[PDB]
Amino acid sequence: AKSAANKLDWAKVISSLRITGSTATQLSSFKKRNDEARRQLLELQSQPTEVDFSHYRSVLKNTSVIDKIESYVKQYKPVKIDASKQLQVIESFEKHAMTNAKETESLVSKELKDLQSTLDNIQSARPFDELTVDDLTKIKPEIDAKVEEMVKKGKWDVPGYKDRFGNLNVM
Amino acid sequence: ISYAAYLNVAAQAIRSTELQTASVLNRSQTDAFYTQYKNASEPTPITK
Amino acid sequence: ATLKEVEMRLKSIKNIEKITKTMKIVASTRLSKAEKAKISAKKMDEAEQLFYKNAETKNKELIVAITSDKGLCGSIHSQLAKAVRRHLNDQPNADIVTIGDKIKMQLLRTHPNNIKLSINGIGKDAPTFQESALIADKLLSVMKAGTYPKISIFYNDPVSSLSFEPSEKPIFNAKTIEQSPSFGKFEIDTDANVPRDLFEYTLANQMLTAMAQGYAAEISARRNAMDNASKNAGDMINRYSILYNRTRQAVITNELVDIITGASS
Amino acid sequence: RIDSVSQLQNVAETTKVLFDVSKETVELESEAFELKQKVELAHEAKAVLDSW
Amino acid sequence: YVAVGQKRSTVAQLVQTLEQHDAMKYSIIVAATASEAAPLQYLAPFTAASIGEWFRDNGKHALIVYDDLSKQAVAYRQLSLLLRRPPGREAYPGDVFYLHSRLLERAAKLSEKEGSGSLTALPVIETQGGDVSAYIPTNVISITDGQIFLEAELFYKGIRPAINVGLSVSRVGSAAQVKALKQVAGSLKLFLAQYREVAAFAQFGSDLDASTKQTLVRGERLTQLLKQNQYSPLATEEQVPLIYAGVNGHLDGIELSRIGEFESSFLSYLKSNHNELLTEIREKGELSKELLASLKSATESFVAT
């Protein structure tokens, strides 16, 4: 009932742990719980829609309100209607939400499978034995670019080389 | 490194036949903590 | 009622009287251990001092303080806190190492910026070299202690096994040792890093002495407070005893009247 | 990186449900007002009658 | 509800409260107002008893509050001394015990033969200065199957309701409470019992053993949990969680000031999510393994956060 809505909400809270930083989506959800509970407390608070026109009207002997307010209550059974044009325009907002949701969904789905392919590609091609440094130059001309820039610079020390391939020095 | 590290360790090391006295053991042991402070702001009671 | 609440309050005071008696006596016992260490320690220190006098080595600053984690030692904690406060006019911002919880709160209140190091777990232990040594080793890095051209320690000098006086003294520091007017009536190598060694040794040897002095005065204070407590409990015992006795008589009188009234009818 | 993407995948679908759910509750509160005036009027009617 | 010796205005406030809580329907108010005669005051419990016995006899269960018997005793005191009967201990002639005992023993859990109809009694003696050694208070204490000592000092201490739990006893039953609730509050008693000793150590403010101060820390939270504002009771299905949390020590950590905050919020949280859990406690009334685990998970879920 109300619990279906709220179970999906709180599931979304522990999902929202993974995507936290929507600070008024969560306030809106807290509100949706609030106002859902407000209508729930309203509808559970709900008195009868009329007087006990049988007993408690036959209680009052005097006749000036017992026909009057009975007929007035039965008159005012018209008590006006609910909005339902708000579920069209809020539904427009839901459409926008859905559009964006699907775009995001599709984007991350593509990326997920891209990452699967990428992992396999790193697995099926990536030396770990020998491999010519020329092949590394061929696959990364970044190698030669930095080298040429260093040769041009008059540098022959790469900074960090020593920090993970310590110098052999006997001095 | 430092002298008080030498003396400290020397006291720790000498208790490492085995036999020893209560005054000795106190002169060579401590079970304690220390709260440095700065601000209030303190790093927690860490073994002294 | 009245009678029972009087009697119970008188009993409370009695139980307290017993506790304060017990504590005062125990204080004498605990105090003895503090002193026992302190004599031998002071004798050891004195041999070093023989050198220091003849050497004429002389002498920011540190404030170090000594109290027990334990309470019910009297107003040693707060007389020392106060005598520290008096000397925390002499240095508003000086960096305080507080050995023991009871002074710690009070000084921490007076300035918290000042507090750089504080200890916890000493205040129940006898003064011993290991403790002093570890504190010393940590001290150079944290407080920059050797750097400071003074070090000063605050403690309670244990004049007698019935007293506590808050007292302070200055310990040698590595700058002081460096610039010392003499240390030439004894000789030692420049190829020995004697400032960094001797500072540390006398950092501990003097500090250990200060701790011993403080701890003994503190437990001595505990006896003083607990004795006055036993007395205070006696006075309240007497007041509620008199009340008890009168109240007891009144119940009898009221009952007696009831018996007479019944008999008369 | 794969782990990060996986979180986002599940989120993207499920959030649309919560949108629907939230707007639905609000609609129900509207209807409750019409009820409320029936509830109210009856209470008032009993009271006026009680005075009588 | 039997009201002896009380003024019409007080009673009028009481009936207003009861009618407000619309419990008046099943309530019967038997009264012997301050105005009403001393014989009538003496007779008022015994005729209240008769009304109760009709329910009891029918197999229907009912409850009789005798508030306050202390004023009934004064009425019998007056009555007897103006029948010129010799004053008893404290001017209540001895046989006052006989009078009270016959009245009190008509509260009975009757046989299945009698329809199981049990009139239950709650006597109320408003002890002046907690003087229980007074003849009528001594007498009543012996007769009754429980004593529910309350204490003014604890009221001032802010424990409202203010219950002197040390002397509060119920010598009878535990099928006098729910099975589930028996399981959770099993060590509520133990914690509290330890707490009493611990509190004594804590007084004089001597440096407590860490273990004693653990007890002290746990105990304090329990005390704040017990307190309840007048005219606000709590449904048992939602008293079982609060006690579970406390007894399973999850509250021991939670700070004393925000125990009250926590309590309110915890209830709201259980209403939202673990309302299934509440329904089960209502439906089955004995905590099963599944309920204990479910409840543990729920409690963890809101104790953390």
From Swiss-Prot, chain A:
Location within or outside the cell: Mitochondrion; Mitochondrion inner membrane
Gene3D superfamilies: 6.10.280.70
Alphabetized Pfam families for the sequence: Mt_ATP-synt_D
One example GO MF annotation: proton transmembrane transporter activity
Highest taxon above the source species: Eukaryota
A biological process term (GO) from this entry: proton motive force-driven ATP synthesis
InterPro entries assigned: ATP_synth_F0_dsu_mt, ATP_synth_F0_dsu_sf_mt
GO cellular component: mitochondrial inner membrane; mitochondrion; proton-transporting ATP synthase complex
Keywords: Acetylation, ATP synthesis, CF(0), Hydrogen ion transport, Ion transport, Membrane, Mitochondrion, Mitochondrion inner membrane, Transport
Family in the record: Belongs to the ATPase d subunit family.
Assembly and oligomerization: F-type ATPases have 2 components, CF(1) - the catalytic core - and CF(0) - the membrane proton channel. In yeast, the dimeric form of ATP synthase consists of 17 polypeptides: alpha, beta, gamma, delta, epsilon, 4 (B), 5 (OSCP), 6 (A), 8, 9 (C), d, E (Tim11), f, g, h, i/j and k.
Note: Present with 6820 molecules/cell in log phase SD medium.
Identification of the protein by name: ATP synthase subunit d, mitochondrial
Organism listed in the record: Saccharomyces cerevisiae (strain ATCC 204508 / S288c) (Baker's yeast)
UniProtKB/Swiss-Prot annotation, chain C:
GO molecular function: proton-transporting ATP synthase activity, rotational mechanism
Principal location class: mitochondrion
Effect of substituting residue 229 to V: Lower activity
Biological process, per Gene Ontology: proton motive force-driven ATP synthesis
SUPFAM superfamilies per UniProt: ATP synthase (F1-ATPase), gamma subunit (SSF52943)
Topology class, membrane: Peripheral membrane protein
A Pfam entry, by short name: ATP-synt
Domain of life, per lineage: Eukaryota
Disulfide bond entries: none
Role: Mitochondrial membrane ATP synthase (F(1)F(0) ATP synthase or Complex V) produces ATP from ADP in the presence of a proton gradient across the membrane which is generated by electron transport complexes of the respiratory chain. F-type ATPases consist of two structural domains, F(1) - containing the extramembraneous catalytic core, and F(0) - containing the membrane proton channel, linked together by a central stalk and a peripheral stalk. During catalysis, ATP synthesis in the catalytic domain of F(1) is coupled via a rotary mechanism of the central stalk subunits to proton translocation.
Protein family (similarity comment): Belongs to the ATPase gamma chain family.
Subunit composition and interactions: F-type ATPases have 2 components, CF(1) - the catalytic core - and CF(0) - the membrane proton channel. CF(1) has five subunits: alpha(3), beta(3), gamma(1), delta(1), epsilon(1). CF(0) has three main subunits: a, b and c.
Record protein name field: ATP synthase subunit gamma, mitochondrial
UniProt source species: Saccharomyces cerevisiae (strain ATCC 204508 / S288c) (Baker's yeast)
UniProtKB/Swiss-Prot annotation, chain D:
Subcellular location: Mitochondrion; Mitochondrion inner membrane
Source taxon at top rank: Eukaryota
Phosphoserine sites (modified residues): 4
Quaternary data: F-type ATPases have 2 components, CF(1) - the catalytic core - and CF(0) - the membrane proton channel. In yeast, the dimeric form of ATP synthase consists of 17 polypeptides: alpha, beta, gamma, delta, epsilon, 4 (B), 5 (OSCP), 6 (A), 8, 9 (C), d, E (Tim11), f, g, h, i/j and k.
Additional remark text: Present with 12900 molecules/cell in log phase SD medium.
Function according to Swiss-Prot or TrEMBL: Mitochondrial membrane ATP synthase (F(1)F(0) ATP synthase or Complex V) produces ATP from ADP in the presence of a proton gradient across the membrane which is generated by electron transport complexes of the respiratory chain. F-type ATPases consist of two structural domains, F(1) - containing the extramembraneous catalytic core, and F(0) - containing the membrane proton channel, linked together by a central stalk and a peripheral stalk. During catalysis, ATP synthesis in the catalytic domain of F(1) is coupled via a rotary mechanism of the central stalk subunits to proton translocation.
Family under the similarity heading: Belongs to the eukaryotic ATPase B chain family.
Name the record gives this protein: ATP synthase subunit 4, mitochondrial
The organism of origin for this protein: Saccharomyces cerevisiae (strain ATCC 204508 / S288c) (Baker's yeast)
Organism phylogeny: Eukaryota, Fungi, Dikarya, Ascomycota, Saccharomycotina
Originating gene: ATP4
Covered residues, full protein: 141 to 192 of 244
From Swiss-Prot, chain E:
Function: Mitochondrial membrane ATP synthase (F(1)F(0) ATP synthase or Complex V) produces ATP from ADP in the presence of a proton gradient across the membrane which is generated by electron transport complexes of the respiratory chain. F-type ATPases consist of two structural domains, F(1) - containing the extramembraneous catalytic core, and F(0) - containing the membrane proton channel, linked together by a central stalk and a peripheral stalk. During catalysis, ATP synthesis in the catalytic domain of F(1) is coupled via a rotary mechanism of the central stalk subunits to proton translocation.
Keyword ATP-binding recorded: yes
Subunit structure: F-type ATPases have 2 components, CF(1) - the catalytic core - and CF(0) - the membrane proton channel. CF(1) has five subunits: alpha(3), beta(3), gamma(1), delta(1), epsilon(1). CF(0) has three main subunits: a, b and c.
UniProt miscellaneous comment: Present with 41500 molecules/cell in log phase SD medium.
Source domain of life: Eukaryota
Positions of the record's site feature: Required for activity: 168
Upper taxonomic lineage: Eukaryota, Fungi, Dikarya, Ascomycota, Saccharomycotina
GO cellular component: cytosol; mitochondrial inner membrane; mitochondrial intermembrane space; mitochondrial nucleoid; mitochondrion; proton-transporting ATP synthase complex
Similarity comment text for this entry: Belongs to the ATPase alpha/beta chains family.
GO molecular function: ADP binding; ATP binding; proton-transporting ATP synthase activity, rotational mechanism
Main localization, broad class: mitochondrion
